[PDB]
Write a protein that binds this ligand. Sequence first.
Ligand SMILES: [Cl-]
Ligand SMILES: [Zn+2]
Ligand SMILES: [Zn+2]
Length: 228
Amino acid sequence: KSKNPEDVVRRYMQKVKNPPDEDCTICMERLVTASGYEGVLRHKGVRPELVGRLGRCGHMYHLLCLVAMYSNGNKDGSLQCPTCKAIYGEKTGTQPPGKMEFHLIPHSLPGFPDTQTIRIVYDIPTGIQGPEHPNPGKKFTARGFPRHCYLPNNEKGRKVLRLLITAWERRLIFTIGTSNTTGESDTVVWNEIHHKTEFGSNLTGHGYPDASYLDNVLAELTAQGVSE
Ligand SMILES: [Cl-]
Ligand SMILES: [Zn+2]
Ligand SMILES: [Zn+2]
């Protein structure tokens, strides 16, 4: 679906024909008067008097106010109610094309004795940045691919695997930006979901044993709108 502010916002807003004499809590003007937003998106846009009820919670805003607010955020397809903090829609990212593969290997991770290991392999080729990327039309590099990641094949590890597949499908695993280890810009980097790339030790901090890892990555996934 389109992630453009006006389209996303209109999707979750339901027109209020006769709004009350109460504040819009985005612009702090009354709902029976025009939106207080005065920026560039007003030009030939949403009529400033239009008011809607947002999603399931029903909180009411000038439609223009909520498109302005959404446009000042990440514009990731999800829309948060500023009154009650309910989130509507699905967060997606800018991960470029590639391949995600996984299978089982007959080796136990440190801290998960007598198990097999889920080996995940991500492969992302170089390409041209698209309109969703920081420098549209500029080439982007992709370093260190294929990247190998590991989870134990136990109940919680399989759960993480299901959720990583969803995050991959929502283009959330990788993004295009600046590497933290090299400083290179216009390059494929990890996004907000940590992976373990070191199998038999944790000298890098990205390895095992790590008894908190599975719970930690489940929280990161939930922070990206990916949960069961
Ligand atoms: Cl990276
Ligand atoms: Zn308003
Ligand atoms: Zn609400």
